[PDB]
């Protein structure tokens, strides 16, 4: 119901480095086109979270707006990775990829995007965790996003914080103490700036509406960059007209009008609560990793 | 798939270089590849100018997006390579190759077209 | 830019023998690198791509190795036709793609 999904904030850029053969409609991803690595986060049913703050950035787009870092090393080559450390993380991650992609990315301890990757004419496996040759495969040209979760900028320094769960001896990669039921679950996390992974006993979430450029989606339908809007007070490339929150602060002239700027449901800065403190992350999501508790 | 470049080998300094790419074979309409130019100027390795794709998004190398436009005509089976302001720097054997469906290396090539640019 | 280094620039071999070519990327570039075969009077031609996989047709003699930085090609048994400029390029960032400097491979006799 929403028209503007594919209108995204920031730059847009859906894509992996190294796989730029669909950066005709990936970069960026806007009203026409296909993206593999897009199109699966707005499949009605899958992805929740996310569709719930669509209007925040993905994985990819904060990569490409420069919020998160790539990992270093920024790729595991499954094909030949058994053994090393990028392998022992994937592996404690339970994700389902679909067929025909080679590859998929994620966020990794550290809060930096990894991923795995397949060599040509490979595909990950349905665990993620492997490759496999498929001779009837139409291969996608995008990675697939292994975790349900949003990004957004922030400056809230979030260095003193780390996971603190309940009588959990282990989470992921994560040694909370020293020790137990073992089980696959479905874990909130977030991170912040300076921090690694923040594993969470829950999500408690709030936003803030403001009327920020990227809490716009501007259209000529064709995208539309809204700096050219100029503000109540200034001048700028172009002249626009939007909708009440958007003549609130911008220069509406409805006559000649180049663009139209709504304001976008599901924007504004999200905030978190951990340890009883309200934090501004980075990126929030969910994951299935290995948890193990205390039963004593 | 084969490709051939064609084009004046002679251009005036400060005129403009233009260079056809011919695909043969079954027609790149409905296809999704990329179609790069590349060049190896006189005593130099090689040079990525650019590239189009199938549907006519185009990237450029940033040190030459000011002086050239790729452009593709997928009812031919051609794209085009024009390139503004030449200088002698500009001489070159360019190709044109068809890039790699899952990153941007380059297989097949052209055979490469000379372009001396001289009064 | 990502800049390609290749080394040596030339080289002199015998028939028969083992050639080795190095090519260091700037930056991390995972296994997006691609080597290509320039011979005299000839365009390029692909040799191996992401790194280690072969061109279909290309001898075994060729074989790629490499993830990161550091990248290998090697030609066993060199023949007297594998005389050429060889280029390794990075496939990693369009922005812009980038090519090594070429290594001229010279047959000893």
């Known amino acids: 119901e929403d028209p503007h999904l594919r209108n995204r904030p920031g730059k847009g850029h859906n894509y992996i480095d190294g796989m730029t053969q669909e950066d005709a409609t990936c970069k960026p991803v806007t009203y026409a086109g296909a993206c593999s690595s897009f199109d699966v986060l707005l499949e009605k049913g899958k992805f929740p979270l996310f569709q719930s703050y669509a209007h925040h950035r993905t994985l990819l787009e904060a990569v490409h707006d420069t919020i998160i870092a790539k990992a270093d090393p920024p790729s595991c080559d499954l094909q030949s990775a058994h053994g090393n450390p990028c392998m022992k993380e994937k592996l404690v991650m339970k994700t389902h990829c679909p067929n025909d992609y080679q590859s998929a990315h994620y966020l990794n301890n550290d809060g930096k995007m990894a991923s795995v990757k397949c060599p040509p004419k490979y595909e990950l496996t349905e665990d993620c965790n492997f490759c496999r040759q498929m001779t009837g495969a139409s291969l996608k040209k995008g990675s697939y996003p292994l975790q349900d979760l949003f990004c957004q900028s922030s400056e809230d320094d979030g260095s003193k914080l780390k996971t603190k769960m309940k009588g959990v001896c282990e989470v992921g990669v994560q040694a909370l103490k020293k020790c137990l039921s073992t089980a696959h679950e479905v874990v909130p996390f977030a991170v912040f700036k300076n921090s690694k992974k923040v594993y969470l006993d829950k999500l408690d979430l709030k936003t803030e509406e403001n009327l920020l450029p990227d809490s716009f989606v501007c259209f000529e339908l064709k995208s539309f960059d809204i700096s050219q809007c100029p503000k109540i007070g200034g001048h700028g490339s172009k002249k626009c007209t939007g909708d009440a929150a958007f003549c609130s602060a911008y220069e509406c002239t409805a006559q000649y009008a180049n663009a139209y700027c709504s304001h976008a449901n599901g924007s504004g800065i999200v905030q978190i609560q951990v340890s009883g403190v309200w934090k501004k992350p980075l990126c929030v999501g969910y994951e299935r990793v290995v948890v193990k508790r205390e039963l004593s | 798939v084969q490709l051939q470049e064609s084009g004046p080998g002679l251009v005036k300094p400060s005129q403009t270089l233009s260079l056809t790419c011919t695909v043969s074979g079954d027609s790149i309409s409905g296809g999704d590849y990329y179609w790069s130019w590349i060049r190896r100027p006189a005593g130099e390795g090689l040079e990525w100018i650019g590239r189009?794709?199938?549907?006519?998004?185009?990237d450029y190398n940033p040190s030459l997006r000011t002086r050239v436009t790729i452009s593709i005509d997928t009812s031919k089976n051609h794209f085009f390579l024009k390139m503004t302001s030449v200088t002698a720097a500009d001489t070159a054997v360019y190709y044109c190759?068809?890039?790699?469906?899952?990153?941007?290396?380059?297989?097949?090539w052209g055979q490469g077209a000379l372009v001396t640019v001289s009064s | 830019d990502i800049q390609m280094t290749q080394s040596p620039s030339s080289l002199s071999a015998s028939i028969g023998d083992r050639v080795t070519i190095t090519c260091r990327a700037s930056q991390h570039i995972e296994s997006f690198l691609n080597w290509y075969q320039q011979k005299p009077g000839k365009a390029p031609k692909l040799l191996i791509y992401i790194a280690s996989t072969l061109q279909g047709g290309v001898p075994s003699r060729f074989s790629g190795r490499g993830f990161g930085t550091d990248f290998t090609l090697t030609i066993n048994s060199l023949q007297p036709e594998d005389f050429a400029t060889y280029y390794c390029?990075?496939?990693?960032?369009?922005?812009?793609?980038?090519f090594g400097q070429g290594t001229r491979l010279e047959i000893k006799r």
């Open positions: 190759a068809r890039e790699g469906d899952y990153s941007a290396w380059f297989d097949p």
């Open positions: 390029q990075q496939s990693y960032t369009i922005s812009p793609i980038t």
């Open positions: 189009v794709h199938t549907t006519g998004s185009t």
